[PDB]
Amino acid sequence: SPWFGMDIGGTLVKLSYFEPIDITAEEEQEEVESLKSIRKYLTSNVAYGSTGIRDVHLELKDLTLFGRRGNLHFIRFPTQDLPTFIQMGRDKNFSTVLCATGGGAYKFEKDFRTIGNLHLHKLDELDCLVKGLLYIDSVSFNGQAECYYFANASEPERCQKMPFNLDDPYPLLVVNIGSGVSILAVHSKDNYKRVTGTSLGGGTFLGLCSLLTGCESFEEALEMASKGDSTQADKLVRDIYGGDYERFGLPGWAVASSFGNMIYKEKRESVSKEDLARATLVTITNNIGSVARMCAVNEKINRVVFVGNFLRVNTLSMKLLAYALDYWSKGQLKALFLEHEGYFGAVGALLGLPNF
Amino acid sequence: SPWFGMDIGGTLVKLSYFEPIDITAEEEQEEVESLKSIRKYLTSNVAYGSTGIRDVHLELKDLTLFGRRGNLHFIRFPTQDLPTFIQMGRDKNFSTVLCATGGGAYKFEKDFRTIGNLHLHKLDELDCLVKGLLYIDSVSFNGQAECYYFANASEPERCQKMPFNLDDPYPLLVVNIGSGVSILAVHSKDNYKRVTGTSLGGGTFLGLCSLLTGCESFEEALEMASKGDSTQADKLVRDIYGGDYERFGLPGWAVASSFGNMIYKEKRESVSKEDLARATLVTITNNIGSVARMCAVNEKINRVVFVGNFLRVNTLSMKLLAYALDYWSKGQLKALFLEHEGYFGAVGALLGLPNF
Ligand SMILES: Nc1ncnc2c1ncn2[C@@H]1O[C@H](COP(=O)(O)OP(=O)(O)NP(=O)(O)O)[C@@H](O)[C@H]1O
Ligand SMILES: Nc1ncnc2c1ncn2[C@@H]1O[C@H](COP(=O)(O)OP(=O)(O)NP(=O)(O)O)[C@@H](O)[C@H]1O
Ligand SMILES: C[C@@H]1CN(c2ccc(Cl)nn2)CCN1C(=O)Cc1ccc(C2CC2)cc1
Ligand SMILES: C[C@@H]1CN(c2ccc(Cl)nn2)CCN1C(=O)Cc1ccc(C2CC2)cc1
Numbered sequence A, B: 001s002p003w004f005g006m007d008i009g010g011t012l013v014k015l016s017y018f019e020p021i022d023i024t025a026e027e028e029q030e031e032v033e034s035l036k037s038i039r040k041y042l043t044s045n046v047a048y049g050s051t052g053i054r055d056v057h058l059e060l061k062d063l064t065l066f067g068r069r070g071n072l073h074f075i076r077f078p079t080q081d082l083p084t085f086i087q088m089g090r091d092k093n094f095s096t097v098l099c100a101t102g103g104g105a106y107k108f109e110k111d112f113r114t115i116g117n118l119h120l121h122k123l124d125e126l127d128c129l130v131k132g133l134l135y136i137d138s139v140s141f142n143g144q145a146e147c148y149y150f151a152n153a154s155e156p157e158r159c160q161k162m163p164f165n166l167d168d169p170y171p172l173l174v175v176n177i178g179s180g181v182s183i184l185a186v187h188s189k190d191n192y193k194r195v196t197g198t199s200l201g202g203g204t205f206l207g208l209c210s211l212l213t214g215c216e217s218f219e220e221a222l223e224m225a226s227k228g229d230s231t232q233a234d235k236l237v238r239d240i241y242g243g244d245y246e247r248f249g250l251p252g253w254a255v256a257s258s259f260g261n262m263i264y265k266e267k268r269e270s271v272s273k274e275d276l277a278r279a280t281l282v283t284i285t286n287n288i289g290s291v292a293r294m295c296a297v298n299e300k301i302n303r304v305v306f307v308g309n310f311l312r313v314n315t316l317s318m319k320l321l322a323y324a325l326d327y328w329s330k331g332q333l334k335a336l337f338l339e340h341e342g343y344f345g346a347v348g349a350l351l352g353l354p355n356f
């Protein structure tokens, strides 16, 4: 049986697949054509159907897992297309213990059981996130750091991505930005809590963008936002005060009211779709950073790691988060990021396989 | 000189006016026609021009202030129309010490000084809020409680507005929902801090609503929202899990992703403008309640009072706030509201008049 871990989220399915590379001669005889066909299909394609993608650059090579050497692969596709995945799974010449997490492990349990003799084991979506994150960081990204930060995030001429060491990772605030946001306080390998969450997450960015701009993809939304000026939509401190609000240390450039200039008909008429995309991104990202900061201060944790796919190919939000956390905490908190940010739940699920 | 206090916000100007009612015979001789004309104009009209409104139901009658008996009046108009107000102020037969707060006391300082021999004294917008709130509560609302809560906010068949006693008001978390949000921790009459704020406030509700629905007023936006179903736009916990997320006590009805269903083209095509208005209101209100709760827990304050004009004629948001704070704090925090919620800064400004 192939070794998969699966995180079925509200928006995306993430799949970790361990490809053995130490297959012997007698081991290839004792394996069925369908097992060979699935291994060949997964490793010889980087697009699967019309919406599946293997993130080739994330592959972990020559990993020893469960006493075998192999490569760990990272694949994603829309949860909306899970029926197609399950149909392909029921197809002839494919007849497995599947560790699954995320909400969809429960919602689609009965659908996975249409695959004959498949054994589905549901695991908790935040327990899998924790052990996946700790595992990838422990094995490294092919010898490079899994974790990084933006050095000198206050100065743009200096702000550069730099590796960050998490060899003693506790305590840790994990901010999981998916469709919504979950915020976790990790005190040990076996001691963590969901301290809170927010419903203003990646799905809010994509949903509002689509309504406001007509964009048809996450990437198109980000490309619109990169061209925009959020201050066309947002009311700033200087629009209210005429400059800084000195008494409480609020700089004139801080957003006083997100989309607050859109109360004026003449401004709604002059704002561009790119401006609205950028205002949506800034609004969502700042609120996440602000909630993360309050949780860090309350939990007394100074390391905040942001994960989830809201941040993939999204350097705008990452830099905004890095700069904001540093500025508003007056340097007391650091924003940390992880190369495998969207996949930790899927890896954690795969790690539960020995328990079955 | 008439006794005014003025709070010039990013969206609305609030004006408190003290009308003396113990004017003697010899006092009426020694007063100028312009002073008489302004008193008559203010007390004989409830609409001023096309956008000024006197909130007659809020009037405090037979108040003793600065050793005089009179009535305290509450008037509001859009900051956008302040040029008209200043022009009327420069008009002949109107030729005052004006205590002003809010950002616009600084932004429009030079404009107020076009009124000859007017003396403008700027006061801080949150210091004025505190002393105004404490003062109105101390004098009562014509003998009724200024402060109220929604009893049994978890049960709708029982949930009713009830008076709340703030005779010993400290400590207190004050959540000021204007264009944006400021959150204050009040420990004594002279000891308070702005613990944080959020840029997702009343101007976000009105701005996003106008973009999403075409509504042209705050009241039209609220009326649209009252007819809508936010779950048409929002992705709920049960849309992701199929039911409750038991492990972390998240009910199926909780919003997992605000506007998160709008990532699907077919749902954007079926959602109504009323649904989007309601989703905007729920998103803004829940985020405010959530931020207020984190601040209360961190500050160790169990009384949270919500003020600002986002909540005027807005019982939907008030009940949402009451229910949410009670539910998510498991009954440890109570949402408190104030009858004069939009005007405390203007009253605080007026109270600074003796210092000049
Ligand atoms: N190709 C993509 N398609 C859709 N959303 C994308 C894509 N790439 C990035 N995103 C963003 O990533 C978010 C989904 O992140 P993800 O961590 O996979 O959440 P999820 O697990 O599907 N949801 P959840 O149930 O809340 O944990 C979306 O809301 C988008 O903001
Ligand atoms: N007639 C109205 N016109 C505009 N907004 C209204 C009106 N009635 C209620 N509101 C709401 O009340 C909000 C303004 O509240 P308010 O407390 O007066 O803020 P402000 O002082 O003008 N802004 P700020 O500079 O942040 O303190 C608006 O954003 C709307 O959500
Ligand atoms: C429980 C928290 C805090 N909520 C409030 C609301 C009002 C108040 Cl007064 N307090 N808290 C708002 C919603 N929440 C969330 O976690 C939303 C949420 C749930 C579930 C997910 C992921 C799918 C797992 C992602 C996101
Ligand atoms: C300083 C706070 C917190 N901000 C962040 C952002 C990122 C991070 Cl990481 N942390 N905090 C977001 C903005 N803020 C505000 O107060 C916004 C704000 C300013 C001013 C007003 C009123 C006009 C007085 C109303 C509202």
Ligand SMILES: [Mg+2]
Pocket: A009, A010, A102, A178, A179
């Ligand atoms: Mg997820």
Ligand SMILES: [Mg+2]
Pocket: B009, B010, B102, B178, B179
């Ligand atoms: Mg204000």
